[PDB]
Amino acid sequence: FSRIVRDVERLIAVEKYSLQGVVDGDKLLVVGFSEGSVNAYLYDGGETVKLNREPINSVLDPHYGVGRVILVRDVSKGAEQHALFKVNTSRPGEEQRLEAVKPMRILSGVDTGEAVVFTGATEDRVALYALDGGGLRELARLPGFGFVSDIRGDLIAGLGFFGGGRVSLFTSNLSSGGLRVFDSGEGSFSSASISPGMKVTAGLETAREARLVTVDPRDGSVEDLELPSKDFSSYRPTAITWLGYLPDGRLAVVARREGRSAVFIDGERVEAPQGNHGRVVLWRGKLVTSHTSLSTPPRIVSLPSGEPLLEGGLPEDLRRSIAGSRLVWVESFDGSRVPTYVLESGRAPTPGPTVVLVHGGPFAEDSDSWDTFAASLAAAGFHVVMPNYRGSTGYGEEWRLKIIGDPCGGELEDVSAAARWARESGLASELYIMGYAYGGYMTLCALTMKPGLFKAGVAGASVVDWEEMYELSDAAFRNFIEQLTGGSREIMRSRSPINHVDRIKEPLALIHPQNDSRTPLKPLLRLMGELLARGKTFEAHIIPDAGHAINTMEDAVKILLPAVFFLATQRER
Template sequence: MTTQHPPAVIPESLFADPEAEARWRARFHAPRMSVPDWALDAPAKNLYVSNASGVWEVYSWDRETDEHRRVTDRPNGTLHATTSPDGAWIWWFNDTDGDEFGSWVREPFAGGERQPAIPDVHDGYPAGLEIGHKLVAVGVSTDDGSRLFAHADGKTSEFYSSKDDAGVASLSRDESLLAIAHSEHGDSRHPAVRVLSTGDFSAVAEKWDGEGKGLDPLEFSPVAGDQRLLVLHERRGREELLIWDVAEDTETELELDLPGEVSAGWYPEADALLVVHFHEGRSSLYRYELATGELSSLDTPKGRIGGASVRPDGTVEYSWSSAAQPPVIRARAADGADTVLLTPPGAPAPGSSHVVDAFVEGPGGRVHALVARPANAPEGPLPTVFTLHGGPHAADEDRFSAYRAVWLDAGFAVIEVNYRGSTGYGSAWRDAIEGRPGLTELEDVAAVYDWAVESGLADKTKCVVNGASWGGYLTLLAIGTQPERWAAGVASVPVADYVAAYEDEMEQLRNFDKALFGGTPETVPAVYKECSPITYVDAVRAPVLVLAGDNDPRCPIRQIENYLDRLAKRDAPYEFYRYDAGHGSLVIAETIKQTAAEVSFALRALEK
């Protein structure tokens, strides 16, 4: 670091009222967990991730004994884990301090000595893992591209390599076929599918829908000998389902009468699909009968499904929350009975406010936003924070968020904008940012901003823009290109200098950026310059807080320092918070510390 940057202020408390202070912290500390995942042939052996220890880590659950065990214990947490199909082993990804670069290790399900999971596979960024009884396939990505390996009969061999993005997707139940996703055609944002024989890893079948139409292989049928592969396609301008019978080389497109987009997984007998439907910030569950085409709702409450799968007995286990209600893990039996499956230890999170929909006409079409008002808010314009989601291929949802709730407690209205680039609104909406990323999204944010001010919701002198990752990038771009709109900006793990970011980021993101920008910084330099926040740093006049992790492979630290050095030369008001982790933190105390810094910074900025 060449310049000493003003450090962020970390307040001891945000609120003078002790109850309010305790409430917002309790939402972050409240124990949460993911939907359990189980071993394919030993469904009593389960894994989930939880923050119960104060750090997101992997836990095992033996349903026969009801024993829960914390598997991992690392300073910066662990998120990625799975089991061997026989339930004997737990595999988890071992990176360094949150940098996402590492290798898979394994240990016995009941606990014991850890060991490298696959010999003779070099470290890298994970690019898929499929574990069978006889064969393991694993993908690794580095600056040199993608390499896929197989391990069988005690030997490891490389069966695929490419300078382009590729990954292991699904292994058939009989372990005779392996599906991979690849981007040999040069566009990692719209991949193709190849199915290989695991005998000699020769290509058995290939499917690519052409330019701008991606295919996402989800999973093979769970029935041995059934070589049907479930695939997401976008032939009609949105993500839909098809079933590809690889053995017969036939496919069936499933045209579901649902708005928005869908994903799915198999029921255990492969006679039906569990469909997850996403539309306008909310998700729901359906059962689709393959023989009859009948689609039936599982009648989940309005909100967000955070994960769902089907047990061998047909029970659907899922995570659900809404903006007002904290997440819960539920089980819906085949007879329709719906009960709470698991409750983490400790006090549940205090609730928060509902969100309502706003639909605003923007330059590229109707923009959907989620709007929340503080409880007991006074009439008239409010201080308002525009929280911009990451991705960019993601979406804000009607889900519980301790982060949204603390801004509401601080007296801000909160507006979450599903700008062009967001998922769930069709392929054209998602891909509209190609060739002009960042600036396109901010046109939609500006339209929602204007609506919020004109409707009397937002005080135009007290509007804050914030976000993390892609949302952090948009925040820095917003305060530079729309300086008249924003009273403050809060950017967490952002892209700040896109050319330097491209040079330092992980290879998968370089491939993504090449497809998004239409080339590299060398081939389309004008696009990178136009869409980079550092280009507009001299126009910034709002105070800005930047937060960044030392080990971030997605938004690396050097390019953030470049931006801050430019701010320092202007004597512009800013603060910097730097921490020892990667692309965000899995440590709850650290998340609370950063959140306190963000809200405090915004409140102080609005007082000036």
């Protein structure tokens, strides 16, 4: 119990870095989980220079060598009403609030140096904004979640979750605003970047593969892009993580298959460390990207050598607690094969205690990437099983869109099949389910719809009721709920665990930040009322002055520690 705490504390404390871009001539801009919280840093050598004062949540994407940085900070104690703060790179530590932009949920943004363009959600709308020297302007209204991808001159390109689970491309004008929307009949756009020729290069994920295409925003036309080298085409990428034009004109692309990515410059393979990679930037003539894996916390590395510029050195004893890792393909209820990542604990027997750690989203994936949750479970003596249920990214448009109109249906059958495989393959002596957000939704759905499958369940920041959640949701989240549920109230009611509490038979632990604005605490209080009234065994932990997105190490401990305690308790007994 005391050893558990120090392992959790040390795993959360280890330093983690995302690469954001290039600023102040030729210094890398990094977001860093270091020294207590997410902070923004500069790197040119060399030691790090803290730009921000109090903890932040992210930064807007800078154009190359711009001379300032836009911090995004929650000013609502976790409810994700963000304000924007500008920091001049010459005077690090001094912040100026952008008063023209009122508190809203900031979803993304790019800073061109003259203009701050971003997307934001309020109660009454989702919209695309521009803030320049002549004030703030609303450029266009969006149907739902929308993300600024790139700006070149007056052209703004982006990605829109505007209907049916599909991702559109959208453009606008920096000066006159407006909105054009381009929808593919084959699938969904994953990334975007404006070429020198003012077309929009974009990753197009279709049924069971992916490729590069070129969209003309002037007449909506689209054609396949062929690159100088044939390494990208011959890689057979099933998904595209990110793309972007370097300042020297070359197209950097990161693509993946089976939970592992690969870098490509003008179509040609560039050798990077095994795992997954983030955006790519040009720094002092050399290539630089982020790297992570199941055995490697996020870091900044050079390519092609793979030498680290900013690595949080994980301790060796914590490294040894992960005995191994495999990708396996679990047969589900309908013959589909569910790609599933597996960690064996070195501190567990085989067979042994096993947790099916269900990812959120649901448009996300378990990949060869660092997972603090999974890591701490392995240290605590649990094998970890992580199924990419249908709805997951990274295995094609067909697999991803299968969840639409069918929450608590096909995807739950995949999670259940992963649990059955862990038993039958010989890895699992007992089985638990654990998850955060949509993962926590899956915990609740497993315990109500599939009683007896798991021994116990952990449900964090969970979806409880589609109906009441929609009532408390802003414009962005109302729309996203419509898409996933197909818009029918029959689905919203029947697929909500709050309506099936009488069926629960196994211990349940609930963990929830009090000011969560995505999955709100209110319906969870009602769930507790139901569990109490129906004599069900449950545990609950509500975290103060915190929301869905953790940005301190104190808050991370508060949402992860009770979960590991709870599962170690159930194992003892």
